Amino acid sequence: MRAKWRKKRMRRLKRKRRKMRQRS
Amino acid sequence: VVDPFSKKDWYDVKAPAMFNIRNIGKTLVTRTQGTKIASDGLKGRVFEVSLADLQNDEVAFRKFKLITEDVQGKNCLTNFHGMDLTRDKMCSMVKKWQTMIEAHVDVKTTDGYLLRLFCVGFTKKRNNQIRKTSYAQHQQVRQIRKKMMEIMTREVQTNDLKEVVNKLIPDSIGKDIEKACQSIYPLHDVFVRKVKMLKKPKFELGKLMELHGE
Amino acid sequence: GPQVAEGENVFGVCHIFASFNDTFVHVTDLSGKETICRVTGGMKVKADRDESSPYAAMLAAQDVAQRCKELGITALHIKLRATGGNRTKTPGPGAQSALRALARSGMKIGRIEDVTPIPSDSTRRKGGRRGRR
Amino acid sequence: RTKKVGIVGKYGTRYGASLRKMVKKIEISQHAKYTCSFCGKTKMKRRAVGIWHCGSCMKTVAGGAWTYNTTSAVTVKSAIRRLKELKDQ
Amino acid sequence: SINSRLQLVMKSGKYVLGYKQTLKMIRQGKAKLVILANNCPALRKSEIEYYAMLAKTGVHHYSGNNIELGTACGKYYRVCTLAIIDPGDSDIIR
Amino acid sequence: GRGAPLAKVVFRDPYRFKKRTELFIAAEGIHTGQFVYCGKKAQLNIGNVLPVGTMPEGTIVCCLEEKPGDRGKLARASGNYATVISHNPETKKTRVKLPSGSKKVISSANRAVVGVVAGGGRIDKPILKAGRAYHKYKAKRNCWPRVRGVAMNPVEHPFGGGNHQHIGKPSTIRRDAPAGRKVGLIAARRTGRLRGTKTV
Amino acid sequence: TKKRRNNGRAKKGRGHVQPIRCTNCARCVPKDKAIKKFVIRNIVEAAAVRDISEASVFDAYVLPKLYVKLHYCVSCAIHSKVVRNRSREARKDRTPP
RNA sequence: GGUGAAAUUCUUGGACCGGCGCAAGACGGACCAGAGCGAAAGCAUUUGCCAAGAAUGUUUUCAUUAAUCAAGAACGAAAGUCGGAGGUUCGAAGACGAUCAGAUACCGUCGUAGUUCCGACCAUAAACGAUGCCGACUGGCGAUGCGGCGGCGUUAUUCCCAUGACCCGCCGGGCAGCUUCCGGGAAACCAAAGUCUUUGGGUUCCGGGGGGAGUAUGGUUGCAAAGCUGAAACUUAAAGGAAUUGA
Ligand SMILES: [Zn+2]
Ligand SMILES: [Zn+2]
Known part of the structure; x- marks a missing residue:
């Protein structure tokens, strides 16, 4: 994990999490 | 197959007869052939003629450009239209740790020629001076620039294109500005950076013939 | 050619546009409105690689000298240009060799100028700003 | 009275938020x-x-159409004044 | 600096604001300076200049409009025509 | 039916005692009580009518004549204008940029009004309503409620019919197609989303 | 730690510097931080000048010079061999001779 | 035209070139630097106008009216969003051409959004002096800006003072090196990163082994992307800083 692209992956895991809660 | 060096003819260029060398060069031009005009085609041409070959004992870093006005048979006439000091001189007198002052002004002469004059000044470090920098304050630069504004207006507005070009040939305006500015700050490299026109009156054969025959 | 005495010289202006890819030597009358010739390093060599090499520039310069000697023009002033504008202010390698041949061929060369376009500040410069190759 | 709808509260929900x-x-x-x-x-x-x-x-x-002065009008008026002054002087 | 001189006429001098009062002052010789806004009606501007020519008094054309001339007089309303009766300051020059 | 406002201008007849009334396209900025001037010696002001030959380059014009002697044919819609590019005094021709971006060589004796047509920005506001669209075209012509050919029957449109709502044939049609066949995209040089600016 | 007190560039006072493209790899680098040198090279190589001179018409009055500005960023400054790495007391130096 | 070397591509309907003009919208090179101004982000063509400010000077004025600061507020590189003006040059996304086993990239040519101005959002960066503000003390040497003071002289306005400009200093406010066994520090290095166990001038923000984790959840802002506030369970004996000699 490079610092920035770990941050990008965490953001993209967060965006997927938000859509799951929205549909539920 | 056909070489275009025969379908054209050469004319000799003559500047106004107020310089030292009238002959400048021979410029080829196409024949009329019943469609185009060689006189109108040669009109609007501009030959750049420095003072090195325009005179014989003048500076070699002042370029004079001349606009054609009329054609007399095999002859081609010209007229001063603008000037610019060489950029190889330009880059050489600008150095480090010094100050430059510009001033641009538009002045119209009585003949109807609108002229935009640029003047350039540089602060002079004295012989004994030892300080690394020689800056002039914003307040001194503004009044120095105003001085070049007023001096150039006086020396151009009241003089014709005849007189103004005769004044710029020895660069007397650049020396006058430097000496007058020695009161506030003596200056070392002072000349006129550029002179360009903006408008012209109606072209007249009488004026051009008078200039070329005087 | 013009009808002039042997004691005088046929004068004209010459521009040497120098770049790192292809040098350009071009000769016209004083004003430049009428045109005498143009030779470059491109027409010299089959490969586009050596358009900027000195050897092709000398062969191109000899092309200027012989074809302009045929017309009847001998004396030429020089005005130098780099790529100019935004690109480098430094003339490329194809300037020394081309000027060497046009001096060895016997043509007269007098005043020298630099009329490279030097902006107060031109617009944004191609490339972008990051990474190389 | 309203938080953000302002004058387009007369349209209710009847069109898109961006269009309103x-x-x-x-x-x-x-x-x-x-x-x-x-x-x-x-x-x-x-x-x-x-x-x-x-x-x-x-x-x-x-x-x-909706404003008293269009930006295109102001630029054109200023440009025509410049072109007229260049003709005169 | 015309606005600073006008400010000192308001504190110390005498003046009339508005078009009807200046015409009265011009026709009875009490007007020393007359100031017109730039958006004054053309007919009214010409009439005031004619009244001032007959009464031999000066007309100054203020740079701004009636909204800005009134503000220059310290007032919270528009002023289009004003006449100075007594300067009290150095506005006599022009 | 016309977004651009119109100006009623009264002139004075030079041959008999009578005042003339003209209906101009109102250049943006003109006002009631203003004096407009028409001629080759008219000054360069917004609202004046001048030949394009006497106009300098870069001048913004509206209600421009396509051919000399017309009464204004180009750049007449609201917020539109044409630009003078260059003149050719030898041939008495002038190049003008039209509001579509096209470039046209016209005679220099063509006249035009200095400025832009008033009422610009009209297309910026969304119509927002079927009713507002209805009122817009009630003043123009009977064209507004547009049924789709795919929603029609094959007897009234080439795109009608089918058990699904589909065109069934390429919608790009040739230029020489008959009248009842020239539907869809007539002589399309390309289709789809544009990437840049397309011009001839 | 700080390898360089200067932090590589010459900018200690101001906040920003306009970038200049590298000659060898075409990479943007701040001007003050890049290795910038003035190169004066004769148009013709010193050994090769004579061949041109012999064929030259001019009475030894023409000596054209090619002057080109040089800009290398630091990643390829080394490859060029310019700016070879210095010793621990070495860094604190200047022009070189 | 361009590459280490090659090309896509513009090209006998005349590109490139040189000369004369016109239009477009950006940006102000060499001057311009350990120099100035602003609370910061920032600020460079000439000119006019508006309002403001530091330092200085003062035998003027109020006479404690005093500084950072919970809560609360305003401005805030660049990028991004909405909206309206034209796209000159550059240039995400994207496309095309080379280079290799692959090249989703570096190189070249275009190129939308963007890069421009205007109104409202967005509040982030290595917004780094990786270095809070107010206050006292605490070596020196050669310089720069401002203002004030003294002067042998040189020089221009000139014909006197005077006004400019150079040189020598002094005083107060600064941006600053450079040396230095002041000193402190783990050292690298620093007159503050000193006066610190011989520990107390005032006070705000902020850290408490490494991860989990700037995550979950709640709240709030945003058109979205996301921003602000922000855990616990569980898991690890090291992660780290500086410096020593080799490679
Ligand atoms: Zn009204
Ligand atoms: Zn590089």
């Missing part, structure tokens, strides 16, 4: 009263599209 937001800016400018440059009174209303009237000095001016 775009028309909000235009409807404020098309119904505003501007200061008259001729008499100085703030009575320059809009009669129809492109027509602006002052109810004090009774002056009618051709203007913009």
Whole structure:
């Protein structure tokens, strides 16, 4: 994990999490 | 197959007869052939003629450009239209740790020629001076620039294109500005950076013939 | 050619546009409105690689000298240009060799100028700003 | 009374939020009263599209569709003045 | 600096604001300077200049409009025509 | 039916005692009580009518004549204008940029009004309503409620019919197609989303 | 730690510097931080000047010079061999001779 | 035209070139630097106008009116969003051409959004002096800006003072090196990163082994992307800083 692209992956895991809660 | 060096003819260029060398060069031009005009085609041409070959004992870093006005048979006439000091001189007198002052002004002469004059000044470090920098304050630069504004207006507005070009040939305006500015700050490299026109009156054969025959 | 005495010289202006890819030597009358010739390093060599090499520039310069000697023009002033504008202010390698041949061929060369376009500040410069190759 | 809807509260939910937001800016400018440059009174209303009237000095001016002065008009007027001055001097 | 001189006429001098009062002052010789806004009606501007020519008094054309001339007089209303009766300051020059 | 406001201008007849009334396209900025000037010696002001030959380059014009002697044919819609590019005094021709971006060589004796047409920005506001669209075209012509050919039957449109709502054939049609066949995209040089600016 | 007190560039006072493209790899680098040198090279190589001179018409009055500005960023400054790495007391130096 | 070397591509309907003009919208090179101004982000063509400010000077004025600061507020590189003006040059996304086993990239040519101005959002960066503000003390040497003071002389306005400009200093406010066994520090290095166990001038923000984790959840802002506030369970004996000699 490079610092920035770990941050990008965490953001993209967060965006997927938000859509799951929205549909539920 | 056909070489275009025969379908054209050469004319000799003559500047106004107020310089030292009238002959400048021979410029080829196409024949009329019943469609185009060689006189109108040669009109609007501009030959750049420095003072090195325009005179014989003048500076070699002042370029004079001349606009054609009329054609007399095999002859081609010209007229001063603008000037610019060489950029190889330009880059050489600008150095480090010094100050430059510009001033641009538009002045119209009585003949109807609108002229935009640029003047350039540089602060002079004295012989004994030892300080690394020689800056002039914003307040001194503004009044120095105003001085070049007023001096150039006086020396151009009241003089014709005849007189103004005769004044710029020895660069007397650049020396006058430097000496007058020695009161506030003596200056070392002072000349006129550029002179360009903006408008012209109606072209007249009488004026051009008078200039070329005087 | 013009009808002039042997004691005088046929004068004209010459521009040497120098770049790192292809040098350009071009000769016209004083004003430049009428045109005498143009030779470059491109027409010299089959490969586009050596358009900027000195050897092709000398062969191109000899092309200027012989074809302009045929017309009847001998004396030429020089005005130098780099790529100019935004690109480098430094003339490329194809300037020394081309000027060497046009001096060895016997043509007269007098005043020298630099009329490279030097902006107060031109617009944004191609490339972008990051990474190389 | 409202948080953000302003003048487009008359449309309720009946169109998109973005369409109501775009028309909000235009409807404020098309119904505003501007200061008259001729008499100085703030009575320059809009009669129809492109027509602006002052109810004090009774002056009618051709203007913009929703605003009194379009940016294209100001630039053109300033440019024509420059071109006219260059012709004269 | 015309606005600073006008400010000192308001504190110390005498003046009339508005078009009807200046015409009265011109026709009875009490007007020393007359100031017109730039958006004054053309007919009214010409009439005041004619009244001032007959009464031999000066007309100054203020740079701004009636909204800005009134603000220059310290007032919260528009002023289009004003006449100075007594300067009290150095506005006599022009 | 016309977004651009119109100006009623009264002139004075030079041959008999009578005042003439003209209906101009109102250049943006003109006002009631203003004096407009028409001629070759008219000054360069917004609202004046001048030949394009006497106009300098870069001048913004509206209600431009396509051919000399017309009464204004180009740049007449609201917020539209044409630009003078260059003149050719030898041939008495002038190049003008039209509001579509096209470039046209016209005679220099063509006249035009200095400025832009009033009422610009009209297309910026969304119509927002079927009713507002209805009122817009009630003043123009009977064209507004547009049924789709795919929603029609094959007897009234080439795109009608089918058990699904589909065109069934390429919608790009040739220029020489008959009248009842020239539907869809007539002589399309390309289709789809544009990437840049397309011009001839 | 700080390898360089200067932090590589010459900018200690101001906040920003306009970038200049590298000659060898075409990479943007701040001007003050890049290795910038003035190169004067004769148009013709010193050994090769004579061949041109012999064929030259001019009475030894023409000596054209090619002057080209040089800009290398630091990643390829080394490859060029310019700016070879210095010793621990070495860094604190200047022009070189 | 361009590459280490090659090309896509513009090209006998005349590109490139040189000369004369016109239009477009950006940006102000060499001057311009351990120099100035602003609370910061920032600020460079000439000119006019508006309002403001530091330092200085003062035998003027109020006479404690005093500084960072919970809560609360305003401005805030660049990028991004909405909206309206034209796209000159550059240039995400994207496309095309080379280079290799692959090249989703570096190189070249275009190129939308963007890069421009205007109104409202967005509040982030290595917003780094990786270095809070107010206050006292605490070596020196050669310089720069401002203002004030003294002067042998040189020089221009000139014909006197005077006004400019150079040189020598002094005083107060600064941006600053450079040396230095002041000193402190783990050292690298620093007159503050000193006066610190011989520990107290005032006070705000902020850290408490490494991860989990700037995550979950709640709240709030945003058109979205996301921003602000922000855990616990569980898991690890090291992660780290500086410096020593080799490679
Ligand atoms: Zn009114
Ligand atoms: Zn590099």
